[PDB]
RNA sequence: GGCUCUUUUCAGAGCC
RNA sequence: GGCUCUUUUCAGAGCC
């Protein structure tokens, strides 16, 4: 049809080069390590044909290249007691962001925000002991709404859901289906669209690795990497940090992590894996209600 | 008297023409933020924003080939204002300023006496006050390892230290990267990098070795001139 | 849709990788510098994808390559007298053939063969000088059906129409459209369905690299493309071997060598543009009239 | 006496097994010809083909890590006697034996006085009497080039000429175009290849280089044993 | 070179 | 481990 918008940018990269001189042109040809030899028009056509060997070539997996450019990785830690009793009321103390660019492997932003719980509002012997979080942290930290603000800010900032594609990534169900909902129940705050659905990582190594789920422990698919934990285990950011050291190595693998879990109806639900490959929508502070 | 809590790299690339001329020009193209944690000597936020310049939008061909920057990520990016807003939103989400003591650490002087100060005139923004001191890594490092200025080129600072270059020179945020490397390095080695430089009435002016360690106000967003 | 042939092999060294062991899988693995360190299935599912990776990126590979597999370059030699008078009868005098594979760029096949005219059985002098063929070698040469059933064994050796897709080129229409055209007459053949349609590269190297027709002769084609002739002028086999040196320094370039010149009814016409890229029928002996 | 016009060079592929067992039949499992022109050291036909063994019908996993030869590419492949009456067309066709004088090289002794003689009994074939002489590459290098036996791998060659391998080793018709290059080189370098091997009473014996240049015959298609 | 079609129209694809 | 879908079926993708 030849009526896409890259075809009007080779034309101006044609007329910029049927004006280059034949000394321009074995110039430019030799810094791409291209064969010189030859006469005006040969030089000129040989040049041409590779920028658009290469513009129609980057365009192509621009549009195949429809995966995630960002996966983001948060681990809440939550108010506990002691052998985990079934009628407590969980509420954050911890909302840690990790944010890896696919692309580069390397993590852009490591974010860490402490949450002044209002229920239980004084921490357990046994959470302070598993946690790592002192007193002290939560009484001066804000509430969770100020805070998922805060989250959200630094994710419009870095334009996901706008312009890059992107998906939240946990370890297990819990910290969405879980945490989260209980939260904004508390918080009465409408759950925000954007947590709708995610990357459960223990149903993605284990699919990827072929291991059971009493294998998929954040410690054992570690060493099952050969890599031991780096920072303090039961601390939020540090878990992200090490589930995103997974990430990678699973990215590197060539697991192409995709969204497997989603709410709906404050029911935990599983995700198509043959369903295309789609993007979280861009994150919104959620309203009261 | 307690160090610095951050060190927060920024290495401005700009508009510009073959052969370097004195009176130049320059407009930020590229605002690249790499936010360093002196405690655990990680880097916690990595921050690139290409910059549209309004005066000379278009790219000389050498600034194109130096910089790595092409013509189309110029002209879908935001203008300096809307970028240095961003920057700030960051560095206020991070709480430098408040909850934490910061410096900016820049490789050379440059980047805040003369491309920030002129981008600012520019864009008819006043200069940020938070901006106003920062870390010229060449004047630690020439001071530090005692070298001439002429050593203090941040592929040879790489080189005298056993290091090779990240990525693509001159491209801002691998410039800051490997500049925060050289940081890391130097903070490893024993040197607590101090804030050497700063700018009075649009002058640059060296700050004392001996005048205790000051961290720098929390960013805002400069009013309009 | 995996249905393709590609996926099939990807499931057959799967199988392969399966049953290599943990030292298999950590040589192999070292082999291509990936990452070692793991357990027998990471390594097995790292490995697995690279295989997966590298077949994939092998398959679409279609730069540099034509869409027919094979080449054939064929440039007669045929009788002639001083001053090219309009009324002698022209009879091939060599058949030269060289095949040219289109994704290597390396000639595969070159066969020379000559040929006893019937007609003009005695060569001309200016004939013997133009295309170096003395006398001695038309006299124990066979007859054009003969060379012509050795030609196309050669082309039905190297499964040509079968197998591969492949087209004859051709410098000048005068070949296949009055040369074959005029033998085929002579040796009461009916003309070869085969030799129906070619590439004329001088049509192709016109329109490429936009030249006018009165530049597109051979030598000039070479000066131009900065390079010297290869053994000596006039001579078929030489000629059509220079010939496939122009098909190659063009297919590099990255132009698609098309047919564009077919022959109805004894009438030279050109093959459409815009129509699909055909390939050429496997060669038959044509029988008698 | 004039030399050879044409050399062909013919590096099997065949079954295999870890570890190389001695008493272990192999079956030609590819046939690849190589026609160098030694007026010219110009290649002037390459012809590769698959053949479909009969015994070992199931390629090892070994053999198809080694040889990079599927087996699809097996299955599809033709019988050994069909693949050698195709690679005599084609010697016919370029009159190897009648208009040009022609050898056979190998890269080593194995390639016909193993692989081609236990093929031809699997294949119920007679011997083709033109293949009972040939060049072992190997030999000339090591006698021209004054290395042992274990200095004449391919590869080694190959280093020791200031060539890097070309393609994939143990591709049948890699290693042919590889071992071509040797011949090319040996051949720049002075030495003229000489038919230094043979097949009599089918145990290998040594062709003296005091005998003179002789032809190997034209190739006929063996007839059935 | 003379042409002829094409929002690749500072350009593309052909034709005698 | 248990299952379930799929001419990647000596394999692939998922589920509890
Ligand atoms: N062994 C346990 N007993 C009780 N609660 C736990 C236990 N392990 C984890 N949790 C809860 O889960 C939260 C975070 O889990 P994780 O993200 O797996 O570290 C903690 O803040 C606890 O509230
Ligand atoms: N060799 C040079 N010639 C002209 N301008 C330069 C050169 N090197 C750096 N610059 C300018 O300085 C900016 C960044 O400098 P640096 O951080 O030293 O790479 C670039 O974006 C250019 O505008
Ligand atoms: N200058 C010429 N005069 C007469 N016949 C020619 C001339 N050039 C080519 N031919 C004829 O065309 C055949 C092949 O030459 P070419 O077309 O140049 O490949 C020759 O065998 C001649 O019969
Ligand atoms: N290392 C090896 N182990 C087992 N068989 C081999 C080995 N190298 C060569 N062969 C056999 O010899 C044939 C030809 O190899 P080459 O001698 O490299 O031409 C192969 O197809 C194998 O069957
Ligand atoms: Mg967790
Ligand atoms: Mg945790
Ligand atoms: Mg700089
Ligand atoms: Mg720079
Ligand atoms: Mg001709
Ligand atoms: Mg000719
Ligand atoms: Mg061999
Ligand atoms: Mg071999």
Same sequence: chains 1, 3.
Wanted: hydrophobic letters at 35%.
């Amino acid at each position: 049809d030849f009526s896409d918008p890259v075809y009007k940018e080779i034309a101006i990269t044609n007329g910029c080069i049927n004006r280059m001189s034949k000394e321009e042109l074995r110039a430019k040809l030799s810094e791409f390590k291209l064969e010189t030899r030859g006469v005006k028009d040969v030089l000129k056509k040989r040049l041409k044909n590779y920028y658009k060997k290469q513009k129609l070539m980057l365009k192509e997996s621009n549009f195949a290249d429809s995966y995630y450019d960002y996966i983001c990785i948060i681990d809440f830690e939550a108010t506990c007691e002691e052998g985990n009793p079934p009628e407590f009321v969980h509420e954050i103390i911890e909302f840690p962001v990790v944010l890896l660019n696919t692309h580069t492997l390397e993590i852009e932003d490591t974010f860490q925000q402490y949450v002044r719980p209002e229920i239980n509002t004084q921490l357990s012997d046994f959470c302070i002991s598993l946690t790592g979080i002192t007193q002290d942290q939560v009484d001066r930290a804000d509430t969770f709404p100020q805070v998922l603000k805060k989250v959200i800010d630094l994710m419009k900032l870095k334009e996901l859901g706008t312009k890059y594609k992107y998906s939240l990534l946990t370890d297990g169900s819990w910290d969405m289906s879980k945490f989260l909902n209980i939260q904004c129940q508390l918080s009465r705050l409408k759950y925000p669209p954007f947590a709708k659905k995610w990357i459960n990582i223990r149903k993605s190594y284990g699919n990827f690795y072929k291991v059971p789920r009493s294998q998929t422990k954040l410690t054992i698919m570690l060493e099952k990497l050969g890599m031991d934990y780096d920072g303090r285990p039961n601390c939020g950011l540090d878990d992200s940090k090490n589930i995103a050291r997974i990430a990678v190595r699973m990215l590197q693998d060539g697991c192409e992590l995709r969204i497997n879990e989603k709410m709906h109806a404050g029911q935990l639900m599983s995700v198509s894996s043959s369903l295309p490959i789609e993007g979280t929508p861009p994150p919104q502070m959620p309203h009261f209600r | 008297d307690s160090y610095y809590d951050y060190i927060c790299i920024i290495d401005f690339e700009a508009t510009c023409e073959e052969g370097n001329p004195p009176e130049f020009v320059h407009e930020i193209i590229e605002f690249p933020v790499v936010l360093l944690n002196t405690h655990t000597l990680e880097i916690e936020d990595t921050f690139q924003q290409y910059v549209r310049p309004e005066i000379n939008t278009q790219l000389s061909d050498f600034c194109i080939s130096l910089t790595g920057i092409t013509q189309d990520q110029v002209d879908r990016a935001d203008t300096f204002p809307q970028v240095l807003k961003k920057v700030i939103d960051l560095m206020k989400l991070k709480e430098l300023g408040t909850k934490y003591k910061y410096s900016l650490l820049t490789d050379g002087s440059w980047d805040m006496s003369k491309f920030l100060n002129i981008q600012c005139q520019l864009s008819r923004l006043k200069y940020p006050p938070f901006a106003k001191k920062w870390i010229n890594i060449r004047k630690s490092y020439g001071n530090f390892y005692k070298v001439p200025r002429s050593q203090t080129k941040l592929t040879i600072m790489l080189e005298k230290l056993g290091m090779d270059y990240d990525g693509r020179p001159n491209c801002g945020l691998d410039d800051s990267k490997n500049i925060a490397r050289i940081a890391v390095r130097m903070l490893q080695d024993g040197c607590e990098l101090r804030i050497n430089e700063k700018m009075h009435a649009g002058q640059l002016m060296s700050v004392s070795s001996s005048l205790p360690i000051e961290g720098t106000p929390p960013p805002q967003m400069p009013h309009f001139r």
